[PDB]
Design a protein around this ligand. Sequence first.
Ligand SMILES: CCCCCCCCCCCCCCCC(=O)OC[C@H](COP(=O)(O)OC[C@@H](O)CO)OC(=O)CCCCCCCCCCCCCCC
Ligand SMILES: CCCCCCCCCCCCCCCC(=O)OC[C@H](COP(=O)(O)OC[C@@H](O)CO)OC(=O)CCCCCCCCCCCCCCC
Ligand SMILES: CCCCCCCCCCCCCCCC(=O)OC[C@H](COP(=O)(O)OC[C@@H](O)CO)OC(=O)CCCCCCCCCCCCCCC
Ligand SMILES: CCCCCCCCCCCCCCCC(=O)OC[C@H](COP(=O)(O)OC[C@@H](O)CO)OC(=O)CCCCCCCCCCCCCCC
Ligand SMILES: CCCCCCCCCCCCCCCC(=O)OC[C@H](COP(=O)(O)OC[C@@H](O)CO)OC(=O)CCCCCCCCCCCCCCC
Ligand SMILES: CCCCCCCCCCCCCCCC(=O)OC[C@H](COP(=O)(O)OC[C@@H](O)CO)OC(=O)CCCCCCCCCCCCCCC
Ligand SMILES: CCCCCCCCCCCCCCCC(=O)OC[C@H](COP(=O)(O)OC[C@@H](O)CO)OC(=O)CCCCCCCCCCCCCCC
Ligand SMILES: CCCCCCCCCCCCCCCC(=O)OC[C@H](COP(=O)(O)OC[C@@H](O)CO)OC(=O)CCCCCCCCCCCCCCC
Ligand SMILES: CCCCCCCCCCCCCCCC(=O)OC[C@H](COP(=O)(O)OC[C@@H](O)CO)OC(=O)CCCCCCCCCCCCCCC
Ligand SMILES: CCCCCCCCCCCCCCCC(=O)OC[C@H](COP(=O)(O)OC[C@@H](O)CO)OC(=O)CCCCCCCCCCCCCCC
Ligand SMILES: CCCCCCCCCCCCCCCC(=O)OC[C@H](COP(=O)(O)OC[C@@H](O)CO)OC(=O)CCCCCCCCCCCCCCC
Ligand SMILES: CCCCCCCCCCCCCCCC(=O)OC[C@H](COP(=O)(O)OC[C@@H](O)CO)OC(=O)CCCCCCCCCCCCCCC
Ligand SMILES: CCCCCCCCCCCCCCCC(=O)OC[C@H](COP(=O)(O)OC[C@@H](O)CO)OC(=O)CCCCCCCCCCCCCCC
Lengths: 64, 64, 64, 64, 64, 64, 64, 64, 64, 64, 64, 64, 64, 64, 64, 64, 64, 64, 64, 64, 64, 64
Amino acid sequence: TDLLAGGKDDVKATFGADSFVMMCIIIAELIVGVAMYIRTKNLLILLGLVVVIVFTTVGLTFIK
Amino acid sequence: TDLLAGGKDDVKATFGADSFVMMCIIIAELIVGVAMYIRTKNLLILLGLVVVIVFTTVGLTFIK
Amino acid sequence: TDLLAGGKDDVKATFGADSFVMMCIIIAELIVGVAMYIRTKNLLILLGLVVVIVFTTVGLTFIK
Amino acid sequence: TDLLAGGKDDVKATFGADSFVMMCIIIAELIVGVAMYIRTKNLLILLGLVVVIVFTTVGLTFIK
Amino acid sequence: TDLLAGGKDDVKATFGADSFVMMCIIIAELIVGVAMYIRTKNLLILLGLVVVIVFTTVGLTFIK
Amino acid sequence: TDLLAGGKDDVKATFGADSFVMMCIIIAELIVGVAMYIRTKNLLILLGLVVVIVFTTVGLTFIK
Amino acid sequence: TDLLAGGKDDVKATFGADSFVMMCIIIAELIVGVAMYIRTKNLLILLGLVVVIVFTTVGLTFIK
Amino acid sequence: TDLLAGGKDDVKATFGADSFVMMCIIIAELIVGVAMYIRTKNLLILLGLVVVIVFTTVGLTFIK
Amino acid sequence: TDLLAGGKDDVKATFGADSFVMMCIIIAELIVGVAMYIRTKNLLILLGLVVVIVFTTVGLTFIK
Amino acid sequence: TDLLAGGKDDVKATFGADSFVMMCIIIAELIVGVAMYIRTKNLLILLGLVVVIVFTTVGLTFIK
Amino acid sequence: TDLLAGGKDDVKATFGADSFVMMCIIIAELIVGVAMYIRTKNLLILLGLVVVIVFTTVGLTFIK
Amino acid sequence: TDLLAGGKDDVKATFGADSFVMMCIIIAELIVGVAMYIRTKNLLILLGLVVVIVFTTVGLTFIK
Amino acid sequence: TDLLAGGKDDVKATFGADSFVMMCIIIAELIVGVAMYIRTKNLLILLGLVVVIVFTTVGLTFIK
Amino acid sequence: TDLLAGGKDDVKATFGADSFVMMCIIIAELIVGVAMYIRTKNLLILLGLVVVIVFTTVGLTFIK
Amino acid sequence: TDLLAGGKDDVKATFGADSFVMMCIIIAELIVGVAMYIRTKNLLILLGLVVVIVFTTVGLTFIK
Amino acid sequence: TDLLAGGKDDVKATFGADSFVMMCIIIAELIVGVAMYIRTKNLLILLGLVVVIVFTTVGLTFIK
Amino acid sequence: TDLLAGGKDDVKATFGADSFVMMCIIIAELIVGVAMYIRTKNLLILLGLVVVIVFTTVGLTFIK
Amino acid sequence: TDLLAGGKDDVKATFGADSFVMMCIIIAELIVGVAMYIRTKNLLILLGLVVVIVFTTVGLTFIK
Amino acid sequence: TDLLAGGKDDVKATFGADSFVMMCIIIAELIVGVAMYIRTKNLLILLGLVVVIVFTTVGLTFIK
Amino acid sequence: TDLLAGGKDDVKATFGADSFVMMCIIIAELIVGVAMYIRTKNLLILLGLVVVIVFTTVGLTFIK
Amino acid sequence: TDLLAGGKDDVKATFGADSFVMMCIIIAELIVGVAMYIRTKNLLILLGLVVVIVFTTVGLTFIK
Amino acid sequence: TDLLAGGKDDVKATFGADSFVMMCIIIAELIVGVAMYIRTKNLLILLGLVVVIVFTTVGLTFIK
Ligand SMILES: CCCCCCCCCCCCCCCC(=O)OC[C@H](COP(=O)(O)OC[C@@H](O)CO)OC(=O)CCCCCCCCCCCCCCC
Ligand SMILES: CCCCCCCCCCCCCCCC(=O)OC[C@H](COP(=O)(O)OC[C@@H](O)CO)OC(=O)CCCCCCCCCCCCCCC
Ligand SMILES: CCCCCCCCCCCCCCCC(=O)OC[C@H](COP(=O)(O)OC[C@@H](O)CO)OC(=O)CCCCCCCCCCCCCCC
Ligand SMILES: CCCCCCCCCCCCCCCC(=O)OC[C@H](COP(=O)(O)OC[C@@H](O)CO)OC(=O)CCCCCCCCCCCCCCC
Ligand SMILES: CCCCCCCCCCCCCCCC(=O)OC[C@H](COP(=O)(O)OC[C@@H](O)CO)OC(=O)CCCCCCCCCCCCCCC
Ligand SMILES: CCCCCCCCCCCCCCCC(=O)OC[C@H](COP(=O)(O)OC[C@@H](O)CO)OC(=O)CCCCCCCCCCCCCCC
Ligand SMILES: CCCCCCCCCCCCCCCC(=O)OC[C@H](COP(=O)(O)OC[C@@H](O)CO)OC(=O)CCCCCCCCCCCCCCC
Ligand SMILES: CCCCCCCCCCCCCCCC(=O)OC[C@H](COP(=O)(O)OC[C@@H](O)CO)OC(=O)CCCCCCCCCCCCCCC
Ligand SMILES: CCCCCCCCCCCCCCCC(=O)OC[C@H](COP(=O)(O)OC[C@@H](O)CO)OC(=O)CCCCCCCCCCCCCCC
Ligand SMILES: CCCCCCCCCCCCCCCC(=O)OC[C@H](COP(=O)(O)OC[C@@H](O)CO)OC(=O)CCCCCCCCCCCCCCC
Ligand SMILES: CCCCCCCCCCCCCCCC(=O)OC[C@H](COP(=O)(O)OC[C@@H](O)CO)OC(=O)CCCCCCCCCCCCCCC
Ligand SMILES: CCCCCCCCCCCCCCCC(=O)OC[C@H](COP(=O)(O)OC[C@@H](O)CO)OC(=O)CCCCCCCCCCCCCCC
Ligand SMILES: CCCCCCCCCCCCCCCC(=O)OC[C@H](COP(=O)(O)OC[C@@H](O)CO)OC(=O)CCCCCCCCCCCCCCC
């Protein structure tokens, strides 16, 4: 061989578990979800946050 | 590595616990909830405020 | 950091304890409640006013 | 801050103690109450008028 | 402010002491009361007319 | 500036006191009200006509 | 403007005193009232017819 | 316009004095009244038939 | 700087207190409100007119 | 142009007095009305058939 | 054209005097009526069957 | 320019008083109205036909 | 041309009286109708099947 | 052709008399009907099952 | 074929005679029926249980 | 297979013979029955308790 | 040119009264209309077929 | 944690032992009870006042 | 793993045994129950308070 | 293989037996149920809590 | 051949009987169903879970 | 030729009865259908699976 193997580390660290990008994604889910809930009063929509957390955790496991 | 780690602090402070944004969100919940209650007279809708407070507190705990 | 901290004061004063907005909300509750009472003759509906007053007072305490 | 403080006076005067709106509300209570009494012959329903008067007086005291 | 003060006069005259509406209300009380009396033979029901007259007179005193 | 002041007259005359439009509105109130009364036998609904007349008269006073 | 004044006549004649529409309304009141009376045996309900006649006559007086 | 004047005749004949509809109404009064009398043994209820006949005759006089 | 300051006057006069536009807005509120009331018979809807008047008056105060 | 005058005949015959369409409409009224009557036992609903017949006859008179 | 005249026969036969549909309607009236009678013990409700039979017979006479 | 004046006649005749188009519009109102009435049993909906006739007559008066 | 006349037969046979397509349409009506009936318990909805059968039979008669 | 005739058999067998689909439909009627009966205690609702059975049997007869 | 025949067994066993679903249905009938009886003291309502048992037994016989 | 057989035990134990739910039901019968007896002094109403006990015992026997 | 007059015949025959194209159009209307009716159960939608037939007949009259 | 603990005091004071709300409740019990007694002459109904007093006192003890 | 375990404490404390929310619920039960009792004079309705207390205590035991 | 098998554990733990999500669901059932009971005074509604507990326990058994 | 046969196994295992995807689907049904039940209190909605289980089991049988 | 006849076999096998592609299509229908059902709770949507199976089977018969 993979002629670009050397690039895997930084990329994986910049889009990975404790990255700035994942923090921004969780913040966005929190804000957008609470705004949707305030507008519609559909309590189930708050589970969105849970979903995103799980999806980003488990999902990052498949990134090799 | 995280090539954007240095950006975590300000972002987290601007969308975080004692931020202007969270204050605006709580104000919005209060106003919208009391307006819904005045229109429909459904007392349970006022619990919306509680929900939002809890959701923003606990939720911000998962923002690393 | 909070890059928008400077905006907290005016916002809090315009949607806060002795604001024009809260006065309008209490007026709306009074009018709508007395209209509901005239139509239905359900005396309990007048407690709506009390509820709104309490909800706006206590609620504004959680706005930091 | 209260960026809309200047609007408090006219609003309070148009929905306040000696306003056209309160006169209309008392007239409506009188007419609707006497119609209910003529139909059902329930004398207690006439106390509705008293209630409305009291509710609009005391209630307007909490409008600051 | 009272931005609608100019409307008080006609309204008060159309739902007031010597109005067509009050005449219709007294007529309705008379007819409905005499019909109830013919059906049930409860003499006390005729006092309904008295009540309505008093209620409309005294009541209109509180309309300012 | 008022660059459209010249348009005030005709508009005010076409939606004003003795206009075709106001005649149509009063006719509609009469027909709809008598139909509601025939269906439900709620005599109070006929006061709708009175209300509309008053509302269109007093209301047109605020049209400057 | 009154740019639609020319339309007043036919409209007023088609929904007016001796119109087909008013005839249909009186017929409907007669039929519905006698059906209600046959079902409930409440003699007062027959006064509905009187009411409708009066309401359509006097009411049409206010149509200018 | 009266743009629907031409429709008055048939309508008036189909809901009028010697119509099928009036025959059905009188039949219904007879049957329902005799059934009520058989159940309750209140002789006065039979006067219902008289009432209906009178009401349909006199009433049809006001249909122009 | 304000390179467009010279434009403030006419604009403010064409959308301001005694403008043709505000007259049209009040007319629209009157017509739409009375139509809603005729359809639904919800008396509170007529307060819409009051609201609009107040909102346009107080609101125009904040236009500098 | 009237550049489409030639089309009047067939259209008028296909939606007119003795058309297949009017037969279907009367059949629909009969079926729907008897179904409503079976469900609710409201005898007056059967007059629907009469109404439809009259409405289609008189109405077709205004189709020129 | 009447461009759909050819369709009259089958339609009239499928919703007509001796059709499967009319049989189903009479069966439904019988079952629903006897169920209502068992529940309420109101003997008059059984006349429903008679009504339906008459209504379907006479009614089908007007289907041309 | 009026460089198209010559076109006024045919247009006015093809969309005018005794045109094929107006006939189609009245037919459509009749059919749609009777279908709505069969479905909902709201007798007032039949007045739609009257409205359309009046609206097309008076309206065509303003077409110059 | 008619330069495509030769295509009429197969088309008419594939969308015609005893075609696979018409069988699928009748099956769909049966399934959808019984599902609607199970959900709503509105017996009249089952007549949908009858309608579809009639509509496809008579309708196919006009396909030349 | 009928260019799709060969498809009739399997379709008819998969939505036909002894199919999995019809079994599911009867099961659904049984469950939904007994649930409705438990909630409302309206015994007549159980006849729904009978109706569905009949409707699916007779109906499948018209599927050719 | 019936392209879905293989699915009949499990479905029939999961909604059939000795299934978890039927047990839940009988439990629900027992609880709801005894609650209705405690509230209304109508002994006949307890026969509901019998009905449900019979309906589920006999009904499941028609599930092929 | 019965794909949900494994769920039978806990359900049956939670709504069964010695469950918290049955205890609550018997308590409710006792309280409601003694309250009815205190109000009406109808001694037979106390047999309600017996009925409920029997109904819950025998009934639970049919829960398989 | 008319240098293309010779082409009028075949074109008119291929898109004309008894053409393959018109047959396809009527088939499409039948299928689409019955599908819409099965989905929505709006009986009026079936009149679409009538409309199309009329529109194609009368319309083809204006094709010279 | 209890994120809303700070709100307990005012709420408890506004709906508590010596509150305006409890005063209104006792007044309502007194008026309604004496009106019931005047109508029915059932002396026991006056014990209602006692009940309410006790219920509000003891009940407020369980409010923590 | 439970990726949201850390959130259990505050939530449980904000909706738990000695929370502001439970206090509000008990207050609401007290007020609504005493209002129902004043209106209906059904003493048993006061047991509602007991029920709510028990339900909130025992119920909170199952919150893990 | 199942290319996503590794994700089963955390997901199952975050939506499983002792998760934060299930705690929130039980809390929601408790609050909503007690609010419904306070409003309607239907004691059976409190069994909702039981149902939810059972449904979440047994249901989680089928999650493999 | 089938030039892509080699891909069948992994696909079938990743969307098949004991896959992560099917687990997520069952979890989603459980959560959404219990949320719907808490909101609407319609017990039948809980059968959704059963349906999904059956549908995914039987359905996966047809995946070859 | 047919200069490309030799290509028919592999193509037909790769998009044919037991191909990887058809397996993927059935899987997609199953997943999408169960997701739609979980969201909307419309049981009829599950028949989608049946439809797809039938459509792919019968349809592949016409591929020569
Ligand atoms: C400077 C402008 C000040 C505006 C007036 C202040 C409040 C006066 C209270 C009047 C109440 C009666 C209105 C009836 C006319 C009207 O609009 O009727 C609309 C609607 C009619 O009520 P119903 O639900 O019975 O009617 C339903 C349908 O018929 C409506 O189409 O009223 C409501 O739903 C009232 C609920 C108020 C919800 C709370 C509002 C909180 C915001 C406070 C106001 C905004 C301030 C703006 C600042 C610039
Ligand atoms: C300048 C315009 C002034 C308007 C007149 C002022 C009030 C006169 C009182 C008449 C009462 C009788 C009306 C019966 C005709 C009518 O509408 O009947 C509608 C409805 C009929 O009462 P029921 O509930 O018995 O009937 C139910 C159904 O049959 C209705 O379809 O009446 C009410 O519900 C009355 C409750 C009033 C609720 C309080 C209203 C408070 C607002 C005050 C009025 C608005 C002011 C507008 C300012 C621009
Ligand atoms: C210009 C129009 C003037 C209208 C006539 C004026 C009043 C005449 C009095 C007739 C009374 C008998 C009517 C029986 C025919 C009728 O409608 O019966 C309906 C109903 C029948 O009474 P029951 O409660 O015994 O019957 C219950 C059911 O059978 C009704 O379906 O009567 C009442 O409830 C009467 C209570 C009147 C409530 C007070 C009304 C106050 C408003 C005044 C009138 C409106 C003025 C409109 C101005 C444009
Ligand atoms: C030159 C044209 C003149 C038009 C006639 C003038 C008014 C005649 C009054 C007839 C009333 C009965 C109509 C029933 C036929 C009809 O349309 O029924 C529709 C609808 C049926 O009432 P429901 O709410 O009971 O029915 C609900 C549904 O079944 C409707 O689909 O009626 C209304 O809602 C009436 C409310 C009127 C709202 C106020 C209207 C104010 C505007 C005045 C009219 C416009 C003037 C146009 C100028 C060019
Ligand atoms: C050229 C067409 C002429 C139409 C006939 C003229 C009127 C004949 C009177 C028949 C009354 C009995 C109808 C029962 C059949 C029927 O429709 O029942 C529907 C409904 C049934 O009454 P209930 O409220 O007891 O029933 C409730 C439900 O079962 C209805 O589904 O009747 C009414 O509500 C009647 C109230 C009439 C409201 C006033 C109507 C004013 C408009 C006048 C008529 C329109 C003219 C149209 C001009 C083109
Ligand atoms: C061509 C069709 C001719 C129809 C027959 C003509 C009238 C025969 C009289 C039979 C009366 C007994 C029916 C009991 C069967 C029945 O329906 O019971 C329903 C109901 C039962 O009366 P109760 O109030 O005691 O029962 C209440 C509940 O148990 C009902 O569910 O009866 C009435 O309310 C009768 C009041 C009639 C109201 C006046 C009707 C005026 C319209 C005239 C008839 C319509 C003509 C249609 C023309 C196409
Ligand atoms: C020089 C031109 C003057 C124009 C007339 C002035 C206002 C007259 C008021 C008539 C109101 C009734 C119209 C019904 C005919 C109509 O358009 O109906 C459309 C629509 C129908 O109302 P619904 O929401 O019930 O109907 C929904 C759908 O059926 C519409 O397709 O009406 C509205 O939504 C009204 C809301 C007005 C919103 C406020 C408008 C503020 C702007 C003021 C006007 C513009 C001035 C232009 C200056 C050049
Ligand atoms: C050549 C085709 C001939 C078609 C049959 C002719 C009419 C037969 C009458 C059957 C009525 C019962 C249908 C129930 C099956 C059905 O569709 O139920 C749908 C619906 C169910 O009524 P509900 O309002 O009680 O149900 C509401 C919901 O459950 C519907 O989903 O029925 C109606 O609303 C009926 C109103 C008819 C409105 C008037 C229609 C006027 C047009 C005439 C027919 C079109 C002719 C087409 C020519 C090509
Ligand atoms: C080939 C299919 C043949 C179907 C059977 C023929 C009719 C058998 C009569 C059974 C009546 C009892 C049904 C109870 C089961 C049921 O559905 O209950 C639903 C409903 C329950 O009545 P309630 O109003 O007491 O209940 C209200 C609610 O609980 C309903 O959810 O029943 C009715 O409203 C009956 C009124 C019938 C209206 C007249 C119908 C006219 C159409 C004729 C039938 C359609 C023919 C279709 C041809 C393909
Ligand atoms: C030479 C061609 C002549 C065409 C026939 C003339 C009119 C016959 C009246 C039939 C009415 C029933 C149609 C139902 C079949 C149909 O299309 O249903 C579509 C739609 C269904 O009504 P709903 O709103 O209940 O249904 C909503 C959805 O289900 C529609 O997908 O009907 C309407 O909205 C009718 C409103 C008519 C609006 C006014 C039209 C004015 C124009 C006049 C006609 C055009 C003339 C063309 C000249 C070349
Ligand atoms: C060789 C392929 C044969 C296909 C099967 C033949 C028909 C079997 C009938 C099954 C009906 C149930 C389907 C539910 C699954 C489904 O698709 O649900 C979709 C939809 C769901 O109905 P709802 O309106 O209640 O649902 C709305 C939303 O949830 C949809 O997302 O169903 C309909 O709208 C049915 C209306 C049928 C309209 C008439 C169709 C006429 C065409 C005939 C079929 C095409 C033949 C193709 C030949 C190659
Ligand atoms: C291989 C998969 C087999 C699936 C199971 C077979 C049927 C089992 C019967 C269970 C009924 C209870 C479901 C409640 C759970 C549920 O979905 O509740 C949804 C809904 C809830 O009923 P309500 O109208 O009371 O509720 C309204 C709202 O709360 C819904 O959100 O139920 C219905 O409307 C039932 C009407 C069935 C309409 C007839 C369906 C005909 C199709 C047959 C089934 C499809 C077969 C698919 C083949 C692959
Ligand atoms: C694994 C999960 C097992 C669930 C428990 C099994 C059944 C236990 C019986 C408890 C009954 C009392 C519930 C009261 C709590 C509740 O929900 O109250 C809601 C409602 C309240 O009844 P009311 O009509 O008096 O109340 C009306 C309103 O206040 C409701 O908001 O109850 C009913 O309508 C009961 C009718 C049951 C209809 C038959 C259901 C058949 C399906 C069987 C159960 C589904 C099985 C799911 C399998 C996964």
